[PDB]
Enzyme design. Sequence first.
Site, PDB file in Angstrom:
ATOM      1  N   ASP A  85       1.262   3.908  -3.069  1.00 23.73           N
ATOM      2  CA  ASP A  85       0.715   5.237  -2.815  1.00 23.73           C
ATOM      3  C   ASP A  85       1.717   6.330  -3.196  1.00 23.73           C
ATOM      4  OD1 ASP A  85      -1.607   4.073  -1.795  1.00 23.73           O
ATOM      5  OD2 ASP A  85      -0.952   4.427   0.339  1.00 23.73           O
ATOM      6  N   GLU A 111       0.826  -1.230   0.000  1.00 19.43           N
ATOM      7  CA  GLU A 111       0.000   0.000   0.000  1.00 19.43           C
ATOM      8  C   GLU A 111       0.845   1.257   0.000  1.00 19.43           C
ATOM      9  OE1 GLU A 111      -3.704   0.231   0.107  1.00 19.43           O
ATOM     10  OE2 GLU A 111      -2.851   2.101  -0.613  1.00 19.43           O
ATOM     11  N   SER A 116      -7.133   1.939  -3.920  1.00 14.76           N
ATOM     12  CA  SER A 116      -5.915   2.325  -3.260  1.00 14.76           C
ATOM     13  C   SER A 116      -5.058   3.280  -4.105  1.00 14.76           C
ATOM     14  CB  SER A 116      -4.970   1.143  -2.929  1.00 14.76           C
ATOM     15  OG  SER A 116      -5.519   0.510  -1.745  1.00 14.76           O
TER      16      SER A 116
END
Length: 353
Positions: A78, A74, A274
Amino acid sequence: TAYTPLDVAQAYQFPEGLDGQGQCIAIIELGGGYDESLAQYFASLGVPAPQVVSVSVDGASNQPTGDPSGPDGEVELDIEVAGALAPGAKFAVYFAPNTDAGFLDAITTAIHDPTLKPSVVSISWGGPEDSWTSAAIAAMNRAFLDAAALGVTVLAAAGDSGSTDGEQDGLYHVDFPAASPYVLACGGTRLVASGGRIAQETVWNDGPDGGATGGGVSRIFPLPAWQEHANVPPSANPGASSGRGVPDLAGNADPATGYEVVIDGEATVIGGTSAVAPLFAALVARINQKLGKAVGYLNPTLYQLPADVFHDITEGNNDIANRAQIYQAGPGWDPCTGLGSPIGVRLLQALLP
Ligand SMILES: [Ca+2]
């Protein structure tokens, strides 16, 4: 299919000549870490690697776990997606324990941070809104509210488990914090593009086994005023009232047409909602840079803008639970993709002085 983040920004016609300089993008993290292989990846893309500074919250910090299937996945997704697309921006990554408190505390820390003053907060974590304490909900919302007053744009991924949000109780649920009316909720699509032109864009749905965008109607937060012209239905659950519809905007999240990233030193392809909050966070930083001022809280304006500012998704549904097709995309605002994918140059133009 796979795209670089830059491929996707061209499909969505991001404004050129702007790289987010003068802006600081806060990214909230509840685990994992990154290694400052990030520069490597940005090198590989032909863009400069932006400044990235990590921030300890509630005792947590940048600590990669080595597993590309854990939180590292993640964190680096990101940072790679917004950083590739706002490389002039400074990146502030707030690490907090994965909990109620840490999540709230990372968000409060970012928003009020007097050193780094991010003008954008990207969030790619959450859970069914009905899963949060009463107190955490209220606190989280007042944090968002405080963000709006300081001219900070808070963006949240809407969820990767369809209209049921991974809850297997037979009901439909929306994820929090994307259900907050004070957040720009980002849902997901399947994007087929080339030549900088969108050939096809539909609801992300790869069934039970490959994820689907979250989307729906909140049973905790009332329909906001600015949503009143968006044909939001009641929640499909029985007895359910009017509620805030999720999401507001949507963009490429299908891993079948996903993003080329490097996670824990490995080349791989990844999707999920995400990636969409970091994507639009970079969009907003380029716009703030052009305007010379932070646009802050955007939902009231977005739903007042001409519809042609967005690419409307009208085909598909986010149901992975059953065959009832709940919810369905349609012309205009819908509970799978919201207003659709933003057309960058058109969003900037609508907001110019
Ligand atoms: Ca639509």
